[PDB]
Amino acid sequence: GPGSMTT
Amino acid sequence: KYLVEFRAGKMSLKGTTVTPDKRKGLVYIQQTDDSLIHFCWKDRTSGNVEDDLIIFPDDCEFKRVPQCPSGRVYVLKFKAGSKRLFFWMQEPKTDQDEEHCRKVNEYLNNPP
């Protein structure tokens, strides 16, 4: 995905 | 009665793994009619209040977790049980991150 804290 | 508010997500624990929750969130401190101070987290889409913790002076510290490069992560640490709740700043600018942190500590531990 785009990262744990990225939308 | 809303003393501090800022956009921030929360995190979840599954087993022993901490995973950031991607929900748009709001951290806020509210003093209720009984004069108690509540540290809260609500979902900004639904309005769902999921965290609501009554906190007295010296119970808690709120601090940056500086070693994380993938977000602006803060920890609400409780003396009692060494319990920790993680949050991650969601404002698109970082200008007010440390200020929000300061105000959390001020209103929990040394209010005006």
Residue numbers in the entry:
A (entry chain B): 0 to 6
B (entry chain A): 21 to 132
Task: Give the authors' words.
Crystals were obtained for hRpn13 in the absence of ligands that diffracted to 1.85 Å resolution with one hRpn13 molecule per asymmetric unit. We tested and found that the electron density fit well to the extreme N-terminal (ENT) amino acids, which we define as including the residual G-P-G-S sequence (aG-bP-cG-dS) of the purification tag and M1 – T3 of the native hRpn13 sequence. ENT forms a U-shaped structure with the non-native sequence along one side and the native sequence along the other (yellow and orange, respectively). ENT forms hydrophobic contacts with hRpn13 Pru M1 at the valley of the U structure surrounded by P40, S90 and W108. These amino acids are similarly involved in proteasome binding by interacting with hRpn2 P945 and E946. At the U hinge, a bound water bridges native and non-native amino acids by forming hydrogen bonds with the dS and M1 backbone amide groups and sidechain oxygen of T2. Analysis of ENT in the context of the neighboring asymmetric unit supports this hypothesis, as ENT M1 interacts with the W108-containing surface ( ) of one hRpn13 molecule, named Pru-A, and the F76-containing surface of the neighboring molecule, named Pru-B. The sidechain oxygen and nitrogen atoms of Pru-B D78 and K99 form hydrogen bonds with the main chain cG amide nitrogen and aG carbonyl oxygen, respectively (insert). Between ENT and Pru are 16 residues that span S4 – N20, which are not present in the electron density map.
The CP is capped by a 19S regulatory particle (RP) that houses three ubiquitin-binding substrate receptors, Rpn1, Rpn10 and Rpn132. A pleckstrin-like receptor for ubiquitin (Pru) domain in hRpn13 binds ubiquitin and proteasome subunit hRpn2. hRpn13 Pru binds proteasomes at the extreme C-terminus of hRpn2, which is otherwise intrinsically disordered. Here, we report that hRpn13 Pru also acts as a generalized peptide-binding domain.
